[PDB]
Amino acid sequence: DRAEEERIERWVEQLREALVGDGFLLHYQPVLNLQPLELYQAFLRLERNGEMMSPNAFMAIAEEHDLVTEIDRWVVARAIRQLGERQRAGHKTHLLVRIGPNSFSDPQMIDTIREQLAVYGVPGERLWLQTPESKVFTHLRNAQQFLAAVSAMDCKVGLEQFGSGLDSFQLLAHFHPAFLKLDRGITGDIASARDSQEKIREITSRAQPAGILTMAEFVADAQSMSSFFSAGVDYVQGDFVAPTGPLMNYEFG
Numbered sequence: 001d002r003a004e005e006e007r008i009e010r011w012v013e014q015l016r017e018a019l020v021g022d023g024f025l026l027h028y029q030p031v032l033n034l035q036p037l038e039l040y041q042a043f044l045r046l047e048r049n050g051e052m053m054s055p056n057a058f059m060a061i062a063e064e065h066d067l068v069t070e071i072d073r074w075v076v077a078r079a080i081r082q083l084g085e086r087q088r089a090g091h092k093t094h095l096l097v098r099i100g101p102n103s104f105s106d107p108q109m110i111d112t113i114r115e116q117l118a119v120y121g122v123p124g125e126r127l128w129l130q131t132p133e134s135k136v137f138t139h140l141r142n143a144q145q146f147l148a149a150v151s152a153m154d155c156k157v158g159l160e161q162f163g164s165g166l167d168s169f170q171l172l173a174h175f176h177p178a179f180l181k182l183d184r185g186i187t188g189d190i191a192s193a194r195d196s197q198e199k200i201r202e203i204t205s206r207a208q209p210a211g212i213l214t215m216a217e218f219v220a221d222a223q224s225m226s227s228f229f230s231a232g233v234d235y236v237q238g239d240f241v242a243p244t245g246p247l248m249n250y251e252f253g
Protein backbone atom coordinates (compact mmCIF):
# COMPACT_ATOMS: atom_id res chain seq x y z
CA ASP A 1 0.00 0.00 0.00
CA ARG A 2 3.06 2.26 -0.41
CA ALA A 3 2.57 2.49 -4.22
CA GLU A 4 -1.09 3.45 -3.65
CA GLU A 5 -0.40 6.13 -1.03
CA GLU A 6 2.26 7.50 -3.40
CA ARG A 7 -0.47 7.67 -6.11
CA ILE A 8 -2.82 9.47 -3.70
CA GLU A 9 0.01 11.85 -2.68
CA ARG A 10 0.77 12.84 -6.25
CA TRP A 11 -2.96 13.60 -6.96
CA VAL A 12 -3.09 15.71 -3.83
CA GLU A 13 0.08 17.54 -4.92
CA GLN A 14 -1.36 18.02 -8.41
CA LEU A 15 -4.61 19.48 -7.03
CA ARG A 16 -2.57 21.91 -4.89
CA GLU A 17 -0.55 22.90 -7.99
CA ALA A 18 -3.78 23.38 -9.97
CA LEU A 19 -5.10 25.79 -7.29
CA VAL A 20 -1.92 27.88 -7.32
CA GLY A 21 -1.29 27.72 -11.05
CA ASP A 22 -4.69 28.04 -12.76
CA GLY A 23 -4.76 24.39 -13.81
CA PHE A 24 -8.51 24.12 -13.36
CA LEU A 25 -10.98 25.50 -15.82
CA LEU A 26 -14.71 25.65 -16.32
CA HIS A 27 -16.96 24.23 -18.98
CA TYR A 28 -20.59 25.32 -19.37
CA GLN A 29 -23.94 23.68 -19.99
CA PRO A 30 -26.89 25.78 -21.14
CA VAL A 31 -30.00 25.73 -18.98
CA LEU A 32 -33.16 26.45 -20.99
CA ASN A 33 -36.38 28.05 -19.83
CA LEU A 34 -39.59 26.06 -20.37
CA GLN A 35 -41.13 28.69 -18.02
CA PRO A 36 -36.06 33.11 -20.51
CA LEU A 37 -32.59 33.94 -19.49
CA GLU A 38 -28.99 33.42 -20.60
CA LEU A 39 -28.10 30.79 -17.98
CA TYR A 40 -25.36 28.15 -17.92
CA GLN A 41 -24.19 25.70 -15.28
CA ALA A 42 -20.47 25.60 -14.58
CA PHE A 43 -18.67 22.22 -14.58
CA LEU A 44 -15.12 21.80 -13.34
CA ARG A 45 -12.23 20.43 -15.37
CA LEU A 46 -8.55 19.87 -14.56
CA GLU A 47 -5.96 20.29 -17.37
CA ARG A 48 -3.39 17.61 -16.47
CA ASN A 49 -0.67 17.04 -19.09
CA GLY A 50 -2.88 17.13 -22.24
CA GLU A 51 -6.02 15.68 -20.73
CA MET A 52 -9.13 17.60 -19.90
CA MET A 53 -9.87 15.63 -16.71
CA SER A 54 -13.37 15.20 -15.17
CA PRO A 55 -13.83 15.42 -11.38
CA ASN A 56 -14.66 11.70 -11.47
CA ALA A 57 -10.85 11.38 -11.61
CA PHE A 58 -10.05 13.35 -8.49
CA MET A 59 -12.97 14.42 -6.33
CA ALA A 60 -12.75 11.43 -4.00
CA ILE A 61 -9.14 12.27 -3.19
CA ALA A 62 -10.10 15.97 -2.86
CA GLU A 63 -12.80 15.12 -0.30
CA GLU A 64 -10.48 12.71 1.68
CA HIS A 65 -7.79 15.46 1.86
CA ASP A 66 -10.11 18.35 2.69
CA LEU A 67 -9.51 20.20 -0.61
CA VAL A 68 -13.17 20.60 -1.66
CA THR A 69 -13.65 23.82 0.31
CA GLU A 70 -10.82 25.46 -1.61
CA ILE A 71 -11.82 23.95 -4.97
CA ASP A 72 -15.39 25.33 -4.64
CA ARG A 73 -13.96 28.78 -3.77
CA TRP A 74 -11.80 28.53 -6.93
CA VAL A 75 -14.86 27.67 -9.05
CA VAL A 76 -16.97 30.49 -7.61
CA ALA A 77 -14.15 33.03 -8.14
CA ARG A 78 -13.61 31.81 -11.70
CA ALA A 79 -17.33 31.87 -12.39
CA ILE A 80 -17.62 35.51 -11.22
CA ARG A 81 -14.68 36.46 -13.46
CA GLN A 82 -16.55 34.84 -16.34
CA LEU A 83 -19.73 36.74 -15.52
CA GLY A 84 -17.65 39.95 -15.45
CA GLU A 85 -15.95 39.35 -18.78
CA ARG A 86 -19.24 38.36 -20.37
CA GLN A 87 -20.98 41.50 -19.06
CA ARG A 88 -18.16 43.67 -20.43
CA ALA A 89 -18.56 41.92 -23.81
CA GLY A 90 -22.29 42.83 -23.89
CA HIS A 91 -23.79 39.54 -22.55
CA LYS A 92 -26.26 39.29 -19.64
CA THR A 93 -24.88 35.91 -18.59
CA HIS A 94 -26.00 34.05 -15.48
CA LEU A 95 -24.09 31.14 -13.98
CA LEU A 96 -25.21 28.32 -11.82
CA VAL A 97 -22.35 27.12 -9.59
CA ARG A 98 -22.00 24.22 -7.14
CA ILE A 99 -20.96 24.63 -3.51
CA GLY A 100 -20.84 21.94 -0.85
CA PRO A 101 -21.76 22.11 2.81
CA ASN A 102 -18.24 22.99 4.02
CA SER A 103 -18.70 26.26 2.12
CA PHE A 104 -21.74 27.23 4.19
CA SER A 105 -19.54 28.23 7.15
CA ASP A 106 -16.43 29.20 5.16
CA PRO A 107 -15.80 32.91 5.64
CA GLN A 108 -13.49 32.92 2.61
CA MET A 109 -16.37 31.80 0.38
CA ILE A 110 -18.57 34.71 1.41
CA ASP A 111 -15.52 37.00 1.04
CA THR A 112 -14.85 35.69 -2.46
CA ILE A 113 -18.48 36.27 -3.50
CA ARG A 114 -18.70 39.73 -1.97
CA GLU A 115 -15.34 40.93 -3.27
CA GLN A 116 -15.33 39.39 -6.77
CA LEU A 117 -18.86 40.51 -7.62
CA ALA A 118 -17.79 43.99 -6.64
CA VAL A 119 -14.50 44.14 -8.48
CA TYR A 120 -16.10 42.90 -11.72
CA GLY A 121 -19.22 45.08 -11.23
CA VAL A 122 -21.48 42.04 -11.54
CA PRO A 123 -24.90 42.26 -9.92
CA GLY A 124 -25.49 39.45 -7.48
CA GLU A 125 -28.59 38.27 -9.43
CA ARG A 126 -26.24 36.88 -12.08
CA LEU A 127 -24.86 34.25 -9.67
CA TRP A 128 -26.91 31.23 -8.72
CA LEU A 129 -25.46 28.81 -6.16
CA GLN A 130 -26.71 25.22 -5.76
CA THR A 131 -26.09 22.62 -3.13
CA PRO A 132 -27.59 19.14 -2.70
CA GLU A 133 -30.71 18.95 -0.57
CA SER A 134 -29.17 16.03 1.37
CA LYS A 135 -26.42 18.33 2.65
CA VAL A 136 -28.84 21.04 3.77
CA PHE A 137 -30.78 18.48 5.84
CA THR A 138 -27.64 17.66 7.83
CA HIS A 139 -26.22 21.22 8.01
CA LEU A 140 -29.43 23.27 8.31
CA ARG A 141 -28.23 26.07 10.64
CA ASN A 142 -25.12 26.75 8.57
CA ALA A 143 -27.14 26.51 5.35
CA GLN A 144 -29.62 29.11 6.70
CA GLN A 145 -26.72 31.44 7.64
CA PHE A 146 -25.17 31.01 4.15
CA LEU A 147 -28.52 31.63 2.52
CA ALA A 148 -28.90 34.89 4.45
CA ALA A 149 -25.39 36.10 3.80
CA VAL A 150 -25.47 35.57 0.04
CA SER A 151 -29.06 36.57 -0.54
CA ALA A 152 -28.02 39.96 0.92
CA MET A 153 -26.07 40.31 -2.31
CA ASP A 154 -29.14 39.29 -4.41
CA CYS A 155 -27.50 35.95 -5.39
CA LYS A 156 -29.86 33.00 -5.69
CA VAL A 157 -29.39 29.95 -3.54
CA GLY A 158 -31.09 26.69 -4.43
CA LEU A 159 -31.20 22.96 -3.98
CA GLU A 160 -30.20 20.16 -6.36
CA GLN A 161 -31.19 16.51 -6.06
CA PHE A 162 -34.44 17.71 -4.56
CA GLY A 163 -36.80 14.89 -3.52
CA SER A 164 -40.57 14.52 -3.33
CA GLY A 165 -41.04 13.27 0.26
CA LEU A 166 -42.70 14.99 3.20
CA ASP A 167 -39.21 15.64 4.63
CA SER A 168 -38.70 18.02 1.65
CA PHE A 169 -41.95 19.84 2.30
CA GLN A 170 -40.89 20.27 5.93
CA LEU A 171 -37.49 21.59 4.86
CA LEU A 172 -39.13 24.25 2.71
CA ALA A 173 -40.92 25.62 5.81
CA HIS A 174 -37.48 26.37 7.32
CA PHE A 175 -35.27 27.04 4.29
CA HIS A 176 -36.61 29.15 1.42
CA PRO A 177 -34.56 28.52 -1.70
CA ALA A 178 -34.76 30.56 -4.92
CA PHE A 179 -34.89 27.36 -6.95
CA LEU A 180 -35.17 23.60 -6.76
CA LYS A 181 -33.65 21.07 -9.15
CA LEU A 182 -35.48 17.77 -9.10
CA ASP A 183 -33.54 14.61 -8.39
CA ARG A 184 -33.03 12.45 -11.44
CA GLY A 185 -34.74 9.59 -9.60
CA ILE A 186 -38.08 11.48 -10.05
CA THR A 187 -37.52 12.75 -13.58
CA GLY A 188 -35.79 9.88 -15.45
CA ASP A 189 -39.01 8.27 -16.73
CA ILE A 190 -41.33 11.31 -16.79
CA ALA A 191 -42.29 10.58 -20.43
CA SER A 192 -43.51 7.00 -19.70
CA ALA A 193 -44.58 6.91 -16.00
CA ARG A 194 -47.60 8.40 -14.15
CA ASP A 195 -46.23 8.32 -10.60
CA SER A 196 -43.22 10.42 -11.71
CA GLN A 197 -45.56 12.87 -13.44
CA GLU A 198 -47.44 13.19 -10.11
CA LYS A 199 -44.34 13.72 -7.88
CA ILE A 200 -43.31 16.53 -10.21
CA ARG A 201 -46.78 18.15 -10.11
CA GLU A 202 -46.80 17.98 -6.30
CA ILE A 203 -43.55 19.93 -6.32
CA THR A 204 -44.41 22.51 -9.04
CA SER A 205 -47.89 23.23 -7.58
CA ARG A 206 -46.21 24.15 -4.26
CA ALA A 207 -43.17 25.85 -5.75
CA GLN A 208 -45.01 28.16 -8.17
CA PRO A 209 -47.11 30.02 -5.61
CA ALA A 210 -44.09 30.18 -3.23
CA GLY A 211 -42.01 31.91 -5.93
CA ILE A 212 -39.56 29.00 -6.17
CA LEU A 213 -38.22 28.15 -9.62
CA THR A 214 -38.22 24.50 -10.56
CA MET A 215 -35.63 22.75 -12.73
CA ALA A 216 -35.08 19.32 -14.29
CA GLU A 217 -31.79 17.84 -15.50
CA PHE A 218 -30.44 14.96 -17.61
CA VAL A 219 -33.17 15.57 -20.18
CA ALA A 220 -32.32 13.12 -22.97
CA ASP A 221 -35.17 13.36 -25.44
CA ALA A 222 -38.05 15.38 -26.86
CA GLN A 223 -40.74 13.34 -25.06
CA SER A 224 -39.10 14.02 -21.77
CA MET A 225 -38.66 17.73 -22.62
CA SER A 226 -42.31 17.94 -23.69
CA SER A 227 -43.53 16.35 -20.41
CA PHE A 228 -41.60 18.67 -18.03
CA PHE A 229 -43.33 21.60 -19.75
CA SER A 230 -46.80 20.11 -19.07
CA ALA A 231 -45.97 19.53 -15.42
CA GLY A 232 -45.00 23.23 -15.11
CA VAL A 233 -41.23 22.92 -14.68
CA ASP A 234 -39.42 26.26 -15.24
CA TYR A 235 -36.03 25.07 -16.59
CA VAL A 236 -34.42 22.06 -18.22
CA GLN A 237 -30.87 20.96 -19.02
CA GLY A 238 -29.28 17.85 -20.44
CA ASP A 239 -27.47 16.58 -23.47
CA PHE A 240 -30.70 16.78 -25.50
CA VAL A 241 -30.72 20.55 -24.80
CA ALA A 242 -26.92 20.86 -25.15
CA PRO A 243 -23.84 19.01 -23.70
CA THR A 244 -21.22 20.59 -21.46
CA GLY A 245 -18.55 22.52 -23.53
CA PRO A 246 -15.96 25.25 -23.25
CA LEU A 247 -17.80 28.02 -25.05
CA MET A 248 -20.90 30.07 -24.19
CA ASN A 249 -22.36 30.02 -27.68
CA TYR A 250 -25.84 28.66 -27.10
CA GLU A 251 -28.51 30.75 -28.79
CA PHE A 252 -31.21 31.21 -26.18
CA GLY A 253 -33.29 33.71 -28.18
Ligand SMILES: Nc1nc2c(ncn2[C@@H]2O[C@@H]3COP(=O)(O)O[C@H]4[C@@H](O)[C@H](n5cnc6c(=O)[nH]c(N)nc65)O[C@@H]4COP(=O)(O)O[C@H]3[C@H]2O)c(=O)[nH]1
Nearest residue numbers: 042043044054055056072075098217218219237238239244
Ligand atom coordinates in the same frame (compact mmCIF):
# COMPACT_ATOMS: atom_id res chain seq x y z
N1 LIG B 1 -25.38 17.56 -13.49
C1 LIG B 1 -25.56 17.27 -14.78
N2 LIG B 1 -24.59 16.72 -15.48
C2 LIG B 1 -24.85 16.44 -16.80
C3 LIG B 1 -26.13 16.71 -17.42
N3 LIG B 1 -26.05 16.32 -18.72
C4 LIG B 1 -24.78 15.81 -18.86
N4 LIG B 1 -24.08 15.90 -17.73
C5 LIG B 1 -22.71 15.37 -17.49
O1 LIG B 1 -22.88 14.19 -16.70
C6 LIG B 1 -22.10 14.25 -15.51
C7 LIG B 1 -23.02 14.20 -14.31
O2 LIG B 1 -22.23 14.22 -13.15
P1 LIG B 1 -22.76 14.90 -11.81
O3 LIG B 1 -23.82 14.00 -11.22
O4 LIG B 1 -23.12 16.34 -12.13
O5 LIG B 1 -21.51 14.80 -10.88
C8 LIG B 1 -20.41 15.67 -11.02
C9 LIG B 1 -20.02 16.33 -9.73
O6 LIG B 1 -20.03 15.38 -8.63
C10 LIG B 1 -18.58 16.75 -9.99
N5 LIG B 1 -18.51 18.13 -10.54
C11 LIG B 1 -18.52 18.52 -11.81
N6 LIG B 1 -18.36 19.85 -11.89
C12 LIG B 1 -18.27 20.30 -10.60
C13 LIG B 1 -18.12 21.57 -10.05
O7 LIG B 1 -18.06 22.62 -10.73
N7 LIG B 1 -18.07 21.61 -8.71
C14 LIG B 1 -18.13 20.54 -7.91
N8 LIG B 1 -18.06 20.68 -6.56
N9 LIG B 1 -18.27 19.28 -8.40
C15 LIG B 1 -18.35 19.19 -9.75
O8 LIG B 1 -18.08 15.87 -10.98
C16 LIG B 1 -19.13 14.93 -11.36
C17 LIG B 1 -18.87 14.61 -12.78
O9 LIG B 1 -18.95 15.80 -13.58
P2 LIG B 1 -18.64 15.84 -15.14
O10 LIG B 1 -17.43 15.01 -15.46
O11 LIG B 1 -18.73 17.28 -15.53
O12 LIG B 1 -19.89 15.04 -15.79
C18 LIG B 1 -21.24 15.50 -15.61
C19 LIG B 1 -21.80 16.31 -16.75
O13 LIG B 1 -20.75 16.74 -17.61
C20 LIG B 1 -27.08 17.33 -16.60
O14 LIG B 1 -28.28 17.64 -17.10
N10 LIG B 1 -26.77 17.58 -15.30
